[PDB]
Amino acid sequence: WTATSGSCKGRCFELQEVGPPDCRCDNLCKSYSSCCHDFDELCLKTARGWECTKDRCGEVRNEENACHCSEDCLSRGDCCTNYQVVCKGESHWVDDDCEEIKVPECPAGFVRPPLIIFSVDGFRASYMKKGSKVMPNIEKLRSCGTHAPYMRPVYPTKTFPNLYTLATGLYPESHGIVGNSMYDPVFDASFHLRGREKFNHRWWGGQPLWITATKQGVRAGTFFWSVSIPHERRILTILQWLSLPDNERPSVYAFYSEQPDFSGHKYGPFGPEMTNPLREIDKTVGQLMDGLKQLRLHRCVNVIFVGDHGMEDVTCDRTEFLSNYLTNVDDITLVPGTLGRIRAKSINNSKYDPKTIIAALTCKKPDQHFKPYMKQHLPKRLHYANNRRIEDIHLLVDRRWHVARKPLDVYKKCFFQGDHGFDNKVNSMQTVFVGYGPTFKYRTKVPPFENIELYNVMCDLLGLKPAPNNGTHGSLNHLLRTNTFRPTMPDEVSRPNYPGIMYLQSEFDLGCTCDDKVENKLEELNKRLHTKGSTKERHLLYGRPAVLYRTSYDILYHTDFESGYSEIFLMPLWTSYTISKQAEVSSIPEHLTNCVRPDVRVSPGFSQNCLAYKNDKQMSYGFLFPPYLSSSPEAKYDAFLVTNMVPMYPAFKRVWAYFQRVLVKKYASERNGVNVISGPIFDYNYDGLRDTEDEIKQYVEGSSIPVPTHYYSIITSCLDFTQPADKCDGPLSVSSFILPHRPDNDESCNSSEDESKWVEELMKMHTARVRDIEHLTGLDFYRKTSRSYSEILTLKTYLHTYE
Numbered sequence: 001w002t003a004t005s006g007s008c009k010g011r012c013f014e015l016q017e018v019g020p021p022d023c024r025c026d027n028l029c030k031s032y033s034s035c036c037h038d039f040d041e042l043c044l045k046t047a048r049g050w051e052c053t054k055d056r057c058g059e060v061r062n063e064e065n066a067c068h069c070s071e072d073c074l075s076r077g078d079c080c081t082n083y084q085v086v087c088k089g090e091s092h093w094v095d096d097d098c099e100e101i102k103v104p105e106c107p108a109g110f111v112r113p114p115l116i117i118f119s120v121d122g123f124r125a126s127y128m129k130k131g132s133k134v135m136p137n138i139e140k141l142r143s144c145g146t147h148a149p150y151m152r153p154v155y156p157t158k159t160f161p162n163l164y165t166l167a168t169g170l171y172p173e174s175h176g177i178v179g180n181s182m183y184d185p186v187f188d189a190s191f192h193l194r195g196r197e198k199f200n201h202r203w204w205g206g207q208p209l210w211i212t213a214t215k216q217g218v219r220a221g222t223f224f225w226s227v228s229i230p231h232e233r234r235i236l237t238i239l240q241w242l243s244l245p246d247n248e249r250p251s252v253y254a255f256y257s258e259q260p261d262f263s264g265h266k267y268g269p270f271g272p273e274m275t276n277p278l279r280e281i282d283k284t285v286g287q288l289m290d291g292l293k294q295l296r297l298h299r300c301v302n303v304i305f306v307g308d309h310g311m312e313d314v315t316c317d318r319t320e321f322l323s324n325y326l327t328n329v330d331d332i333t334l335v336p337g338t339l340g341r342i343r344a345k346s347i348n349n350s351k352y353d354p355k356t357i358i359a360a361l362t363c364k365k366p367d368q369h370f371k372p373y374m375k376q377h378l379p380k381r382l383h384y385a386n387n388r389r390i391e392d393i394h395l396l397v398d399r400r401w402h403v404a405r406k407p408l409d410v411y412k413k414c415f416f417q418g419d420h421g422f423d424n425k426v427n428s429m430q431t432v433f434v435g436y437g438p439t440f441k442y443r444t445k446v447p448p449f450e451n452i453e454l455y456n457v458m459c460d461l462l463g464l465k466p467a468p469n470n471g472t473h474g475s476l477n478h479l480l481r482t483n484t485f486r487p488t489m490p491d492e493v494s495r496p497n498y499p500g501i502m503y504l505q506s507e508f509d510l511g512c513t514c515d516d517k518v519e520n521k522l523e524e525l526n527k528r529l530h531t532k533g534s535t536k537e538r539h540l541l542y543g544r545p546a547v548l549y550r551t552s553y554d555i556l557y558h559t560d561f562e563s564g565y566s567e568i569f570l571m572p573l574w575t576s577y578t579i580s581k582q583a584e585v586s587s588i589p590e591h592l593t594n595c596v597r598p599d600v601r602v603s604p605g606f607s608q609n610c611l612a613y614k615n616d617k618q619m620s621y622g623f624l625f626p627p628y629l630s631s632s633p634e635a636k637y638d639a640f641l642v643t644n645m646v647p648m649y650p651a652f653k654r655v656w657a658y659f660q661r662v663l664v665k666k667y668a669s670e671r672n673g674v675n676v677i678s679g680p681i682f683d684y685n686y687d688g689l690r691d692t693e694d695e696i697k698q699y700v701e702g703s704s705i706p707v708p709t710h711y712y713s714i715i716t717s718c719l720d721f722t723q724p725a726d727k728c729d730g731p732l733s734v735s736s737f738i739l740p741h742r743p744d745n746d747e748s749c750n751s752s753e754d755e756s757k758w759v760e761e762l763m764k765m766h767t768a769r770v771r772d773i774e775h776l777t778g779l780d781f782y783r784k785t786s787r788s789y790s791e792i793l794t795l796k797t798y799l800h801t802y803e
């Protein structure tokens with residue numbers, strides 16, 4: 001109910017929100033059907049347009065105008081943005097040569113450079129270069145300011161998840177907005193595009209920048225704008241707010257443009273009709289910067305030009321129908337489009353089974369344009385599982401396609417040529433970032449980064465303390481002239497033991513055998529040194545990983561590799577080794593195929609045993625340091641230590657063996673040596689975080705040996721590849737993966753073929769950031785380099801995309 005009898009007189013775009021049933025005058029009253037009767041007349045004026053013409057110059061003030069050209073308008077903060085250019089012989093901001101902003105130049109009474117977020121829906125990264133001829137204002141921002149070639153959105157690459165991620169620094173699984181459409185089973189409520197449920201506070205998690213600001217005494221303009229408010233009016237409203245007295249004036253503002261998303265959907269990402277939407281956006285940027293100039297704020301304000309996601313070519317005829325795969329089509333609810341989420345249509349149907357749904361969807365057609373997953377099996381880099389609003393069954397749809405339930409859903413609901421939502425590593429989904437102002441660097445290009453990092457930086461720009469978030473604070477310091485935040489490495493929580501030889505062979509009853517009884521001060525003094533860590537500088541290049549939680553573990557040294565061995569999990573947390581470009585691959589000798597050897601540094605009670613793998617018909621074992629890369633026949637025996645062994649399904653050993661036998665050598669060849677750190681991951685509750693001992697859901701049968709959900713590797717070398725990985729003087733280069741440890745290769749449709757045709761493609765899909773592995777393991781890598789900690793944080797957030 002709205003008693004619309006009240007007035008907007010003197011309240012146009014008020015900053016506080018008056019509660020019902022009094023009428024509103026804010027930038028969202030239209031969306032609520034709650035504006036006062038006079039909102040349009042007073043607050044949405046349009047008379048005479050948005051620009052001064054010659055003959056309006058020093059006119060008599062006429063309150064009915066949209067904006068003014070009268071002499072008092074700089075006083076009232078309501079001149080047309082082009083006022084000074086037409087009436088006072090000033091030039092447009094874009095026509096001025098750009099000049100470094102070494103220090104903020106703010107008018108008296110400004111405590112801090114204001115922040116203006118200029119957000120553009122569906123602004124694909126390549127528009128910066130491809131449309132640069134028709135966007136001179138945006139091109140000046142970009143080339144004079146700080147820019148990335150692209151910014152990575154979050155999955156799914158839809159609007160609500162990405163704008164709320166921008167605002168909170170959180171993954172959608174933590175902020176709760178996991179799609180533009182959602183069902184919450186606990187609430188028993190649906191979130192939609194059309195309607196009033198989306199306004200309910202319970203949907204929105206974390207703490208967006210406007211709440212962070214407000215709680216720490218920094219005032220914010222209102223971020224959201226009703227679609228019917230024209231872009232010019234949005235710009236003039238922001239400019240008017242910027243002339244409020246010091247005690248009332250917000251310090252952070254947002255503008256939002258529906259374009260180029262709106263036209264990109266109808267015309268496709270590069271349709272000829274896309275030029276005008278881009279000209280129009282530029283013109284708006286131009287109005288803003290002209291407006292800031294008249295206010296003498298153009299060298300005081302920090303401006304962020306930022307997109308939510310890109311746009312891909314997608315038409316009706318590229319739709320896959322679930323009704324071509326499932327017999328029980330009407331038993332399911334599908335959330336459709338550029339991603340698929342599936343649940344049971346009725347909760348009272350116990351003849352519903354995810355396993356048979358998945359199996360009917362799995363490599364069923366030669367050219368299949370979507371791949372089904374249980375949500376916990378999705379690539380960890382998507383972080384898209386830990387929320388009840390995310391359905392257990394998920395379809396990753398190929399770029400350029402839709403998935404729908406039945407054909408009648410498409411033609412009774414082509415209308416469109418563009419869409420988005422796909423995997424956030426897809427090139428067409430990338431978006432833009434430009435930062436311009438006293439706090440950003442001058443003419444600086446920074447590497448691509450993820451939009452989850454931005455909340456931290458916007459907090460820094462405003463002197464705020466960020467709420468806990470998924471950004472890595474420090475990783476974007478190289479974007480900033482000043483206001484850097486100077487992080488310190490976390491403290492190690494557990495210190496390792498350094499076991500010596502403590503146990504005789506015969507104390508072990510592990511059911512393991514090895515043909516190793518074949519055996520000198522020459523080569524025995526030598527090997528005692530290796531077990532004490534004489535070659536550790538070779539294999540442990542960036543310090544030992546720090547264990548950041550309370551546990552009991554041993555460092556074990558070997559000729560070819562070093563490991564941190566957990567007495568809790570009966571296996572290493574990490575194994576480190578360096579493969580030089582000269583290193584040669586060997587095979588496992590015939591007599592050593594089944595060889596496993598007790599480790600006399602580690603008690604029998606804290607070792608695995610071969611009996612367990614014998615009795616477990618589903619489970620085999622692999623090794624973390626690969627025997628193929630051993631440096632000598634004698635060194636090879638170290639690779640067969642029971643303390644280098646890990647449980648692996650046979651199906652996964654196909655993947656792991658090809659990685660260790662073929663790909664490590666190939667990376668070392670290409671990168672001029674590589675350092676590898678490999679290990680197990682336990683994330684049974686799919687929250688992206690290390691599981692504690694009492695959360696383990698699966699053991700090798702009849703043992704206390706826990707079964708990893710994933711295996712990771714981090715592969716580091718020198719960024720200047722003319723330098724070997726073990727003698728690198730400068731920046732480092734990294735790629736990582738987090739491979740799911742599954743009992744079949746159903747994910748890989750070509751898996752019956754040779755590993756050379758499918759394994760590297762799997763690994764590429766499961767590419768990961770070192771930071772992702774840190775959360776999953778409780779480990780902290782790169783503790784001892786000669787690089788700055790900020791540079792190290794950036795390296796740790798890097799994702800190698802292969803696109």
Ligand SMILES: *[C@@H]1O[C@H](CO)[C@@H](O[C@@H]2O[C@H](CO)[C@@H](O[C@@H]3O[C@H](CO[C@H]4O[C@H](CO[C@H]5O[C@H](CO)[C@@H](O)[C@H](O)[C@@H]5O)[C@@H](O)[C@H](O[C@H]5O[C@H](CO)[C@@H](O)[C@H](O)[C@@H]5O[C@H]5O[C@H](CO)[C@@H](O)[C@H](O)[C@@H]5O)[C@@H]4O)[C@@H](O)[C@H](O[C@H]4O[C@H](CO)[C@@H](O)[C@H](O)[C@@H]4O[C@H]4O[C@H](CO)[C@@H](O)[C@H](O)[C@@H]4O)[C@@H]3O)[C@H](O)[C@H]2NC(C)=O)[C@H](O)[C@H]1NC(C)=O
Pocket residue numbers: 170171173174175176202203204205206207383386387388467468469470687688689775
């Ligand atoms: C990405 O970054 C984020 C943020 O850093 C990481 O997410 C955080 O991770 C933490 C560990 O998983 C988690 O800690 C929880 O917190 C539980 C209580 O939390 C509630 O309050 C939170 C605070 O909000 C306030 O913020 C400021 C202060 O900072 C205040 O001043 C304000 O007043 C704010 O209100 C709040 O964030 C949180 O909201 C979530 O849940 C809401 C729905 O109810 C959603 O609206 C919202 O979106 C959040 O939803 C996400 O997170 C939840 C988990 O919290 C998850 O379920 C959702 O799927 C979604 O992902 C809460 O309202 C606290 O109870 C937990 O403690 C339990 O476990 C410990 C183990 O040590 C026990 O000791 C303890 O007893 C307790 O166990 C009890 O309950 C058990 C389970 O029910 C039971 O088995 C047991 O027997 C016990 O009875 C725990 O500390 C953070 O809440 C979470 N934050 C966010 C924002 O999501 C994230 O991990 C990062 N991701 C990666 C990959 O790195």
Ligand SMILES: O=C(/C=C/c1ccc(OC(F)(F)F)cc1)N1CC[C@@H]2CN(C(=O)N3CCc4[nH]nnc4C3)C[C@@H]2CC1
Pocket residue numbers: 117119121159160163164166167168180193209223224225226227254255256261262306
């Ligand atoms: O005014 C805003 C919000 C401004 C904002 C600015 C910065 C933010 O964060 C920051 F500041 F940190 F950057 C956060 C929000 N809107 C406008 C209104 C609707 C229209 N729309 C659609 O209905 N869709 C539009 C596009 C689209 N493409 N496919 N479906 C759709 C639906 C959705 C919703 C998006 C947000």
Ligand SMILES: [Ca+2]
Pocket residue numbers: 682683684685686687688689690691
């Ligand atoms: Ca976990």
Ligand SMILES: [Zn+2]
Pocket residue numbers: 121122158159160261308309
């Ligand atoms: Zn969008």
